[PDB]
Write a protein that binds this ligand. Structure first.
Ligand code: ADP
Ligand code: ADP
Lengths: 48, 258, 256, 256
């Protein structure tokens, strides 16, 4: 073999701050979730 | 059938012929080759074959077959439909796929590396290329024209370049003659260039040419040609830097120190 | 049937085609020997085409062009095996070829590790696999084909002895066109016709005395692959339909 | 007894057979000085299979199909994904053979660095494995299996001094094919009967005098490989049991 700094290929990945929050969202229980979701509802005035 | 025309600039009676030979093969879809030395005026010709073809409708991408990545060769050549950024709708482009219905220009074919040479091969006549991933390969209708200044036969003897690829590619090879051999369009080439040149350096008007000027410019074997004439004239002209008295002095090489 | 796109009348290509028919029935692998550019590919179809092998998905892969790891991987790489990396792994050409005639080209110019594996596959209908131990057993009919002297390579150890020495039952010759001398004319004509119907000419006006002289004196390294490029090249040099051709070109690197 | 293939009637063959029996029980490296085509790993199979434990795998396959650095990759493989070209851990070749024994084809072929790796490892039995880690040791009997005068290679310093003496604990030089005399006929017969059994022939018709003379003349480069291909290929071209075999196919690649 040999040591070098070449390039590979073929993959797929993408992420963003807001999407992240959307993903962690399903990892926690409804009861503990509804809490997180109530908190959103004070901040947002057009969401009931 | 429309003709681009551009700058034929040939009064050789052999450039005429050169134009005549390429014109017959312009309609043809077969692999072709173009051969030139250090100063040959070949880039225009590759365009003059495709400019003159029915598929003049097609796109005319021309890759630089010497600079590609060894590693990305597979991707660069083919390309991978999955693209990038996950479920992204944007599809990958490709090399041979982005030239369907249009001529493809390959340059520095002799210099093209062994990995590239083996990779060409198998895609030249098969017509099927498959992007990394998937089980489906799609035929492309792509016209191969190759421009090279190096001598292919010598490369074959060495074994540096595969013999089979050269043999398969281009039934007919256009022949370009050196400038020292035109010998005739210099009065014309030389003025044309100089005329451009006057506006690039912002003069009004050419002074004219001394007889001596033309004794020197005829008399020389002009190593790496054409382009050479431009340089001999373009410099010499800006050099002189005026429009009272005519041009009197031309320097062949700006190496010599004095 | 699927042989007129070949032709010949010199008893040489006659005895070649005679041979094909007898051995067509036999499913087991055969060895095809012939010069570069002389019927290896054209011939290949005929073996598959004979009713015994007509039904299947025929795949032909050349080995002289392929790389070390790439060559081994293409025939059978990660078909069932799962490993980190190697995304979208596939069975490869050999697996796809099964149930249909196969021809892997240039057997002599192959990696030595790969050659040993190929011989194993040929023997007793067994194919190795990186994943599951279970070996596939499909009677794909693929015959090894080479152009140069395989036996010479074995003496220096360039070619695995077992792989050749086992399938050195069914060798078949493809003589050069150097030797043929009769097929030239008739082929000349055929190709000629094809390049003028290609450029839209009235009629093929034939050859000259001189044309034939040079045709038959010429050594013709390349055969149909060769000749044909030349035949058409000479076609295109003329482009009118009045008098027969008298200028021809075997080397376009010439000047005049 | 594995059908006891290739029995040698000649005393030289028998003597070597007797010598092999003493060798198998103990853990001593053994070197074979036979010519290619002769003594081809036949006995290698005997020496892994006559040993105290037949349980250990007999991977073998050390033909020098690899020119240089690949051999190292073929051998001690690679570490736990370290360096270029590595995705997982590769135990390689001795770790695979473990418990069992190893065989080397043209040990003479491998580069001095590979030699040097063979000598250090064998005494201790610990193997570096290329990538490197904590030294690891396993017990494997080595067999080695070369073709030219080896002392030549240390006389012209191409074979390591300590490695060569340590490795040829004990030579088992072997018989040439030409040296066998009347065993030709027995070979011929064995192979002929095996062949008619393989091709589902009713019986064997016999030999002739002409074919007998042809075998009596021949120089015969391969102890097993040269003559066996000849006899089965003779039998294949014949394909009949009514008339005795009279034609020999001496070279499968001869013209026409
Ligand atoms: N017939 C011509 N008409 C106009 N310009 C030309 C002609 N021949 C050569 N030239 C000039 O000389 C140069 C030729 O360079 P190019 O053909 O790219 O060299 P090469 O073919 O060796 O790569 C061009 O930039 C062009 O301006
Ligand atoms: N009688 C024929 N009719 C049509 N095409 C032919 C005929 N003979 C040869 N050819 C073409 O000429 C080409 C010659 O290829 P060849 O150089 O023999 O390949 P290889 O070197 O792999 O055997 C073939 O691809 C085939 O299509």
């Amino acid at each position: 073999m040999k040591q070098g700094l070449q390039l590979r290929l073929s993959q797929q990945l993408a992420m963003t701050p807001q999407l992240q929050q959307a993903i962690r969202l399903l990892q926690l229980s409804t009861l503990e979730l509804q809490q997180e979701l109530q908190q959103a509802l004070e901040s947002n005035p057009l969401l009931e | 059938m429309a003709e681009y025309k551009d700058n034929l600039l040939g009064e050789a009676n052999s450039f005429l012929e050169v134009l005549e030979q390429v014109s017959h093969l312009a309609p043809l879809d077969k692999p072709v080759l173009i051969i030139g030395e250090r100063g040959t005026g070949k880039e225009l010709i590759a365009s003059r074959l495709h400019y003159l073809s029915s598929r003049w409708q097609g796109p005319f991408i021309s890759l630089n077959c010497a600079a590609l990545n060894e590693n990305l060769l597979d991707s660069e050549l083919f390309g991978h439909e999955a693209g990038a950024f996950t479920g992204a709708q944007k599809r990958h482009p490709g090399r041979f796929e982005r030239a369907d219905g249009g001529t493809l220009f390959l340059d520095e074919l002799a210099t093209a590396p062994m990995m590239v040479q083996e990779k060409l091969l198998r895609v030249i006549e098969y017509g099927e290329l498959e992007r990394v991933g998937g089980s489906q390969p799609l035929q492309v209708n792509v016209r191969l024209v190759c421009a090279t200044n190096a001598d292919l036969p010598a490369m074959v003897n060495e074994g540096t370049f595969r013999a089979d690829l050269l043999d398969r590619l281009a039934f007919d090879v256009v022949q370009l003659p050196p400038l020292r051999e035109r010998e005739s369009d210099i009065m014309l080439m030389a003025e044309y260039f100089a005329i451009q040149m006057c506006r690039e350096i912002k003069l009004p008007l050419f002074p004219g040419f001394t007889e001596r000027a033309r004794e020197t410019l005829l008399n020389y074997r002009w190593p790496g040609n054409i382009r050479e004439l431009k340089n001999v004239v373009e410099r010499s002209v800006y050099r002189h830097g005026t429009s009272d008295y005519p041009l009197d002095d031309i320097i062949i090489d700006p190496f010599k120190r004095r």
